[PDB]
Paper text:
One of CSFs, Emi2 (also known as F-box only protein 43) inhibits APC/C activity by binding to APC/C-cdc20; therefore, Emi2 blocks the ubiquitin-mediated proteolysis of MPF8910. Subsequently, the phosphorylated threonines in Emi2 can be recognized by Plk1, which undergoes phosphorylation, and these phosphorylated sites serve as a recognition site for SCF, another class of ubiquitin ligases; SCF destabilizes Emi2 and activates APC/C10. In this study, one of our aim was to elucidate recognition of Emi2 by the Polo-box domain (PBD) of Plk1 using X-ray crystallography and biochemical characterization. To elucidate the detailed molecular mechanism of recognition of Emi2 by Plk1-PBD, we determined structure of the complexes of PBD domain (367–603 of Plk1) with peptides Emi2146–177 or Emi2169–177.
Furthermore, new peptidomimetics (699, 700, 701, 702, 703, 704, 705, and 706) that we developed according to the crystal structure of the complex of Plk1- PBD with Emi2, were introduced by microinjection into immature mouse oocytes, and the resulting in vitro maturation was analyzed. To identify the binding modes responsible for this strong activity, we tried to solve the structure of the complex of 103-8 with Plk1-PBD. Unfortunately, our attempts to crystallize the complex of 103-8 with Plk1-PBD were not successful. Instead, we obtained structure of the complex of PBD with peptidomimetic 702, which has a phenyl substituent that anchors bromide and methoxy groups at meta- and para-positions, respectively. The structure of the complex of Plk1-PBD with 702 is very similar to the previously solved structure of Plk1-PBD with 103-5; the latter peptidomimetic contains a hydroxy methyl group. The distance between Tyr417 and the oxygen atom of the methoxy group in 702 was found to be 4.7 Å. This finding could be attributed to the orientation of 702′s functional groups toward Tyr417. The subsequent hydrogen bonding between Tyr417 and the oxygen of the methoxy group in 702 determines the strong binding affinity.
Residue numbers in the entry: 373 to 501, 508 to 593
The structure:
Amino acid sequence: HLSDLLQQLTSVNASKPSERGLVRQEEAEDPACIPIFWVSKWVDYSDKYGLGYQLCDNSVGVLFNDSTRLILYNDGDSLQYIERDGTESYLTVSSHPNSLMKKITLLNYFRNYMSEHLLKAGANITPRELPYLRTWFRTRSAIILHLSNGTVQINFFQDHTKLILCPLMAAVTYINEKRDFQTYRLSLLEEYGCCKELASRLRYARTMVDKLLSS
């Protein structure tokens, strides 16, 4: 899915989408393609444990420093443990192995923090009709998050803009400075252009996706 994403982005960036005689970004807006999942909160505690996050359906997840993941579903009981090599086990809180009690405890600590203390990104948006965090890194400018369903999210720290890239829909959601959420089909930005702000963010995305590919 990453290879596809990189190709979609390269293709948009090659068409010089901000350099058209008239840019019609609004023509590319596609509400069909609004994603199902995105990361609405996150906490990096990789100094000790890992990266905690919440997805827009209120499921919570941790990627542990040992590259394993534990996910609590929005029902508050179902878990999925994903091992370093991707192997999945389905469990519950009411009846878990004791071997996972540490990780479930940690999971509850992230859950309570995120619930007590953080704002839900895209909270006004209805997603369209569960993945885990494959990986993440932070640059000086942003945090990049790569989900197991192929989605890449990027959150830029200074201005608080976010991009959500989905290679399945070949679509991008931009959350701008005023907290407006607009979703675009990549093939139509290729046709009708976009503003320099979005075009700049997409050039950066292209770059971050080639970092994800060499790791």
